From Swiss-Prot, chains A, B:
Keywords: Chaperone, Cytoplasm, Metal-binding, Nickel, Nickel insertion, Zinc. The gene is ureE. Homodimer in diluted solutions, homotetramer in concentrated solutions and when bound to Ni(2+) or Zn(2+). The homodimer is thought to be the active form. Belongs to the UreE family. SUPFAM superfamilies: Urease metallochaperone UreE, C-terminal domain, Urease metallochaperone UreE, N-terminal domain. The keyword Metal-binding applies. Its main location: cytoplasm. This is Urease accessory protein UreE. HAMAP family: UreE (MF_00822). It comes from the Bacteria. GO terms for biological process: protein folding; protein-containing complex assembly; urea metabolic process. It comes from Sporosarcina pasteurii (Bacillus pasteurii).
Length: 141, 141
C-alpha cells in the first residue's frame, strides 16, 4: 500500500469497533517523510508523504470498514537517568551530547536506549539511574 | 628561574603578608608539565616539572621572604549561562557537548568562552546568560 497522507489520530478511535494493525517503527522513524516497512499483520507499507508532512506517534495511515493501520514505536529497554542536582544534570547531559548519543530530556530526567557501554559512563559521572521499558514518543532531532 | 616542583597551594597563604606575583597562563596550559612565560611583574619562569608533575590553578611555584609566585589562568571574555530549571541545565549542556565546546559546569552554571556564534544556540534552548570576564579554573579533560 502507498501512503501519501495521514488520515487521523489513533486516540480518536477509542470507541471504534475497528481492529488496529500496528505499524511498529524505530525512534529514528519519527518525523520522517519516507519509510518502507511491514505491519504486525504483514501488510507492506510505503510511506511517501506528499505534504512537507512528517510521521508522528499514533498517526493513522489507513482506515477501511473494519481495520485501522496506525503507527507506534517499538517497546524497548531504556535507562531513566535521575540526576539529583543541577551540576549532575549538566555533567551527565554534556557527556551524552559529547558522545552524540540520542536522548530525551524532560524535567529532571534523561531518557536513553539501554546500552552497557554508556552504563559505564553514567557511573563515572556518578548519577543514579533505573532500567525500564518505553516506546519513544518524541522525535530526535 | 627553573621550576621543577610545586612548593605550595596559594589558598593556604591567606594570613601571609607576602605579595603574590601571578604567573598568568592559558586555560589549555593547565595540566601541562612544561611552560615558559613571564609573571605579571616581569620574572621569567621556566616550568619543567620533574616526575610526571602537572600544573594546576593555584600552584605556588616559588616563595621568597617577601614574594609568592603562583599560577592563575588569564581573565577572559565568557558567557555565564544560568539555567533556571533542571530541564534547562540538561538541554543546554547537551547542546554544548554535542558541538564539542569546551566548558566548565559548576553547580548551576555553565561557563564558556565568549563566542558570538553561540548566542543563536543559547537563544534556541532558551536559557539566560550574561556576558562577563572569568578565569577558567579547571583543565578541560
Ligand atoms: Ni563529534
Ligand atoms: Zn486525536
Amino acid at each position: 500500500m502507498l501512503i501519501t497522507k495521514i488520515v487521523g489520530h489513533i486516540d480518536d478511535y477509542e470507541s471504534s469497533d475497528k481492529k488496529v494493525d500496528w505499524l511498529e517503527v524505530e525512534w529514528e522513524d519519527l518525523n520522517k517523510r519516507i519509510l518502507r516497512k511491514e505491519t504486525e499483520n504483514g501488510t507492506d507499507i510505503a510511506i511517501k508523504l506528499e505534504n512537507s508532512g512528517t510521521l508522528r506517534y499514533g498517526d493513522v495511515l489507513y482506515e477501511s470498514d473494519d481495520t485501522l493501520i496506525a503507527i507506534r514505536t517499538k517497546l524497548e529497554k531504556v535507562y531513566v537517568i535521575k540526576p539529583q542536582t543541577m551540576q549532575e544534570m549538566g555533567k551527565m547531559a554534556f557527556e551524552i551530547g559529547n558522545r552524540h548519543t540520542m536522548c530525551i530530556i524532560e524535567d529532571d530526567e534523561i531518557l536513553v536506549r539501554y546500552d552497557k557501554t554508556l552504563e559505564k559512563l553514567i557511573d563515572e559521572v556518578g548519577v543514579s539511574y533505573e532500567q525500564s521499558e518505553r516506546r519513544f514518543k518524541e522525535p530526535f532531532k
